[PDB]
Design an enzyme around this catalytic site. Structure first.
Site, mmCIF file in Angstrom:
data_model
loop_
_atom_site.group_PDB
_atom_site.id
_atom_site.type_symbol
_atom_site.label_atom_id
_atom_site.label_comp_id
_atom_site.label_asym_id
_atom_site.label_seq_id
_atom_site.Cartn_x
_atom_site.Cartn_y
_atom_site.Cartn_z
ATOM 1 N N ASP A 166 0.828 -1.234 -0.099
ATOM 2 C CA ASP A 166 -0.095 -0.165 -0.061
ATOM 3 C C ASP A 166 0.815 1.242 -0.004
ATOM 4 O OD1 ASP A 166 -2.471 1.238 -0.135
ATOM 5 O OD2 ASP A 166 -2.922 1.280 1.762
ATOM 6 N N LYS A 168 1.690 4.850 -0.672
ATOM 7 C CA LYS A 168 1.045 5.926 -1.486
ATOM 8 C C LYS A 168 1.553 7.209 -0.388
ATOM 9 C CE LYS A 168 -3.103 4.828 1.004
ATOM 10 N NZ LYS A 168 -4.711 4.441 0.964
ATOM 11 N N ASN A 171 0.100 7.354 3.330
ATOM 12 C CA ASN A 171 0.854 6.172 4.251
ATOM 13 C C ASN A 171 2.139 6.547 4.436
ATOM 14 O OD1 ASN A 171 -1.688 4.737 4.527
ATOM 15 N ND2 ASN A 171 -0.878 3.254 3.107
ATOM 16 N N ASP A 184 0.760 2.413 7.936
ATOM 17 C CA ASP A 184 -0.189 1.179 7.348
ATOM 18 C C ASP A 184 0.195 0.123 6.956
ATOM 19 O OD1 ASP A 184 -2.686 0.391 6.619
ATOM 20 O OD2 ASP A 184 -3.170 2.363 5.384
ATOM 21 N N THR A 201 -4.258 0.339 -3.273
ATOM 22 C CA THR A 201 -5.277 1.733 -3.614
ATOM 23 C C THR A 201 -4.885 1.802 -4.989
ATOM 24 O OG1 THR A 201 -4.574 2.599 -1.427
ATOM 25 C CG2 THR A 201 -5.076 4.258 -3.127
HETATM 26 N N1 LIG Z 1 2.201 6.940 13.520
HETATM 27 C C1 LIG Z 1 1.550 7.785 13.151
HETATM 28 N N2 LIG Z 1 1.632 9.217 13.453
HETATM 29 C C2 LIG Z 1 1.033 10.328 13.020
HETATM 30 N N3 LIG Z 1 -0.129 10.116 12.108
HETATM 31 C C3 LIG Z 1 -0.420 8.684 11.735
HETATM 32 C C4 LIG Z 1 0.462 7.499 12.220
HETATM 33 N N4 LIG Z 1 -0.170 6.344 11.725
HETATM 34 C C5 LIG Z 1 -1.130 6.874 10.797
HETATM 35 N N5 LIG Z 1 -1.290 8.171 10.817
HETATM 36 C C6 LIG Z 1 -2.427 8.962 10.132
HETATM 37 O O1 LIG Z 1 -3.441 8.253 10.414
HETATM 38 C C7 LIG Z 1 -4.057 7.981 8.792
HETATM 39 C C8 LIG Z 1 -4.699 6.690 8.813
HETATM 40 O O2 LIG Z 1 -3.583 5.468 9.297
HETATM 41 P P1 LIG Z 1 -3.571 4.175 8.244
HETATM 42 O O3 LIG Z 1 -2.869 3.186 9.080
HETATM 43 O O4 LIG Z 1 -3.208 4.597 6.918
HETATM 44 O O5 LIG Z 1 -5.075 3.779 8.271
HETATM 45 P P2 LIG Z 1 -6.119 2.640 7.156
HETATM 46 O O6 LIG Z 1 -7.242 2.779 7.983
HETATM 47 O O7 LIG Z 1 -5.295 1.542 7.113
HETATM 48 N N6 LIG Z 1 -6.179 3.821 5.941
HETATM 49 P P3 LIG Z 1 -5.924 3.045 4.472
HETATM 50 O O8 LIG Z 1 -5.851 1.585 4.234
HETATM 51 O O9 LIG Z 1 -4.722 3.992 3.618
HETATM 52 O O10 LIG Z 1 -7.283 3.610 3.738
HETATM 53 C C9 LIG Z 1 -2.557 7.933 8.318
HETATM 54 O O11 LIG Z 1 -2.828 8.436 6.688
HETATM 55 C C10 LIG Z 1 -1.933 9.239 8.812
HETATM 56 O O12 LIG Z 1 -2.589 10.456 8.190
HETATM 57 MG MG LIG Z 2 -4.638 0.815 5.394
HETATM 58 MG MG LIG Z 3 -3.510 4.403 5.022
#
Ligand SMILES: Nc1ncnc2c1ncn2[C@@H]1O[C@H](COP(=O)(O)OP(=O)(O)NP(=O)(O)O)[C@@H](O)[C@H]1O
Ligand SMILES: [Mg+2]
Ligand SMILES: [Mg+2]
Ligand SMILES: *C(=O)CCCCCCCCCCCCC
Lengths: 350, 20
Positions: A166, A168, A171, A184, A201
């Site tokens: 993933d 992008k 992430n 992520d 994505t």
């Molecule tokens: N360690 C971190 N510190 C700060 N912000 C974070 C961190 N981890 C995640 N984020 C923020 O939280 C968002 C969502 O986390 P993510 O792990 O990408 O969730 P997701 O539900 O798997 N999203 P997706 O699968 O990309 O649709 C990220 O795009 C960042 O904006």
């Molecule tokens: Mg994700």
């Molecule tokens: Mg994400």
């Protein structure tokens, strides 16, 4: 890294040893994962940093230490409903086991009746995505600095038999030194053979994913091509209003480059955005070295990047501890924890 | 311009991951 500078290729045995020791460390954690290392009442929940399909990531403050962290919250029932149990178990098992300068650190994990929780270091500089959209595009040296970190990160992950799946800008987080932290791991998977899950994505999917063909770690190298293109152009190589239209463009593989792209950049991208697997950089006999030795990366000191000794193109603004100015605002919702345990058997190992 | 076409498109905001 002096030897690599003093004699290119002379570091290859040492890199091999580094990776062998890294795999030993990883395997110990992979085989005996950490579990239940904090609990919900140890944190103050401050603000949502991002929402996703199964929950959200929140800025939290650890009450006893005062440290800030980013807590990913996943609703067990929704994970089960969407058939994402195995992916979520992969995510946590892999993230707790890895250790690399450009991978976000998982500090704690736990579960309760309703949710799974992953508590990561808070990376306060925001998503690369936000900065990229605001500024428009990155210059080639700026894009290259970030790309180099991803190349090294994939060299590390792939050596552990991990596929990331993933890549992008959403992430990729920018830390207080201007370096990348990959977050992520929702689709990360440890796999020695080919795999088949349609996930990622849309803009970043390799043609072999789209076409339900079976695929391998070469999909991460394709995604790197998309990322480099998007960073340097300001828009993705394959874009449209709807995923179906994007998929049509990807499998044509026709790519057009902005006139401002350097010749070296265009050549690198033709080799990463290569539909033919026998021809795609990262997937040839010399593996990652075809990328690392490409003309576009000639100015890149790989070991200096690893050591974080290179001056970053910019440092995000930092107002103090717990500052969320580099992130968008999201609608907040009360975390409710049920009095009945949900999906206990499914998430036993978490 | 390709840039103007992108900016007018429906996918310039944060993109969610997909799965089946
Ligand atoms: N360690 C971190 N510190 C700060 N912000 C974070 C961190 N981890 C995640 N984020 C923020 O939280 C968002 C969502 O986390 P993510 O792990 O990408 O969730 P997701 O539900 O798997 N999203 P997706 O699968 O990309 O649709 C990220 O795009 C960042 O904006
Ligand atoms: Mg994700
Ligand atoms: Mg994400
Ligand atoms: C410098 O040239 C001396 C030899 C360096 C060997 C150690 C470098 C290990 C870091 C390599 C980057 C990570 C690969 C994923």
């Amino acid at each position: 890294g002096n030897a690599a500078a003093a004699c290119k290729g002379s570091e290859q045995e040492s890199v091999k040893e580094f990776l062998a020791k890294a795999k030993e460390d990883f395997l110990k954690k992979w085989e005996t994962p950490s579990q239940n290392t904090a609990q919900l009442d140890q944190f103050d929940r401050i603000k949502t940093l991002g929402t996703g399909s199964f929950g959200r990531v929140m800025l939290v403050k650890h009450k006893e230490s005062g440290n800030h962290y980013a807590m990913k919250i996943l609703d067990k029932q929704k994970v089960v409903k969407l058939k994402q149990i195995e992916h979520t178990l992969n995510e946590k098992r892999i993230l707790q086991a890895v250790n690399f300068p450009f991978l976000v650190k998982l500090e704690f994990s736990f579960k309760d009746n309703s949710n799974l929780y992953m508590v990561m270091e808070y990376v306060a500089g925001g998503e690369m995505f936000s900065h990229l959209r605001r500024i428009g595009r990155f210059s080639e040296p700026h894009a290259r600095f970030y790309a180099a970190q991803i190349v090294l990160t994939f060299e590390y992950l792939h050596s552990l038999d991990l596929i990331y799946r993933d890549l992008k800008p959403e992430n990729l987080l920018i830390d207080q030194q201007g370096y990348i932290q990959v977050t992520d791991f929702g689709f990360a998977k440890r796999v020695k053979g080919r795999t088949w899950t349609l996930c990622g994505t849309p803009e970043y999917l390799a043609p072999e994913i789209i076409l339900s063909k079976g695929y391998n770690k070469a999909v991460d190298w394709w995604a790197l091509g998309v990322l480099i293109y998007e960073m340097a152009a300001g828009y993705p190589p394959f874009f449209a209003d709807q995923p179906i239209q994007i998929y049509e463009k990807i499998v044509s593989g026709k790519v057009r480059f902005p006139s401002h792209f350097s010749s070296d950049l265009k050549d690198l991208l033709r080799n990463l955005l290569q539909v033919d697997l026998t021809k795609r950089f990262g997937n040839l006999k010399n593996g990652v070295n075809d990328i690392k030795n490409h003309k576009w990366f000639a100015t890149t000191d790989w070991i200096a990047i690893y050591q974080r000794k290179v001056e970053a193109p910019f440092i995000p603004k930092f107002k103090g501890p717990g500052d969320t100015s580099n992130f968008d605002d999201y609608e907040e919702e009360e975390i409710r924890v049920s009095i009945n345990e949900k999906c206990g058997k499914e998430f036993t190992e978490f | 311009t390709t840039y103007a076409d992108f900016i007018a498109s429906g996918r310039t905001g944060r993109r969610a991951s997909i799965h089946d």
